[PDB]
C-alpha cells in the first residue's frame, strides 16, 4: 500500500490528482493539485498545495490561481488515510472571494486512491 509519503500521488473519484511533494519532520506538507472533475473550472494545470499530516490525519488546501487560470477561490480538504490499497477519505470546503455568507461555501466529499 502507498502511504502518506513525500512524492506520493493520489487520485480522486473525479480523476483529480493530489501530489504530495514533501512532508517535513513536523508534518508540514507541500504539494500540488491538478483538478480534472468533469465540467469544473481550473482544470488540467498545477495549483500549489500546503497542509499538515498527523499520523493518518491529513489536511491540504489550494488557492486556485496560477499562470493559466484563476477561479478566485480556495479549497480545503480534511481527511484521513486508510488501507492492500492506500486511500485518503476527505471532506472539502470551497470558499470564493467576495462571499457574504457561510452558506456560500461549497462542501463535498472526495476519496483519493494511491497511484
Ligand X SMILES: O=C(O)CCCC[C@@H]1SC[C@@H]2NC(=O)N[C@@H]21
Specify binding-site residues for biotin: 12, 16, 33, 35, 41, 73, 75, 110
| 35 touches a copy of itself (CB under 8 A) | no
How far apart, in whole angstroms, are the C-alpha atoms of residue 111 and residue 52?
18
Q: Is 103 helix (H, G, I), strand (E, B) or coil?
A: helix
How far apart, in whole angstroms, are the C-alpha atoms of residue 27 and residue 24?
5
| 14 touches ligand X (CB under 6 A) | yes
Q: Smaller CB distance to a copy of itself: residue 8 or 90?
A: 90
Return the residue matching grid coordinates 473550472: 41
Here's the x/- map for ligand X, 39-78, by CB under 6 A: it reads as: -xxx---------------------x------x-x-x---
Binding partner of residue 76 among a copy of itself, ligand X, none, CB cut-off 5 to 8 Å per kind:
a copy of itself
Q: Which three cell numbers stand for residue 52?
A: 499538515
Binding partner of residue 69 among a copy of itself, ligand X, none, CB cut-off 5 to 8 Å per kind:
none
Q: Which three cell numbers stand for residue 12?
A: 480522486
Paired residues of 10 in beta bridges: 18, 114
Q: Which three cell numbers stand for residue 2?
A: 502507498
Residue of 2, 80, 92, 111 that binds ligand X (CB under 6 A): 92
Amino acid at each position: 500500500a502507498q502511504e502518506l509519503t513525500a512524492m506520493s500521488a493520489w487520485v480522486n473519484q473525479d480523476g483529480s490528482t493530489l501530489y504530495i511533494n514533501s512532508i517535513n519532520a513536523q508534518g508540514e506538507l507541500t504539494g500540488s493539485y491538478i483538478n480534472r472533475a468533469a465540467g469544473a473550472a481550473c482544470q488540467n494545470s498545477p495549483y500549489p498545495v500546503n497542509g499538515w499530516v498527523f499520523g493518518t490525519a491529513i489536511s491540504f488546501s489550494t488557492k486556485w490561481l496560477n499562470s493559466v487560470e484563476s477561479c478566485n477561490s480556495i479549497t480545503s480538504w480534511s481527511g484521513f488515510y486508510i488501507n492492500g490499497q492506500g486511500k485518503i477519505s476527505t471532506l472539502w470546503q470551497l470558499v470564493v472571494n467576495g462571499s457574504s455568507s457561510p452558506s456560500q461555501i461549497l462542501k463535498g466529499q472526495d476519496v483519493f486512491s494511491q497511484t
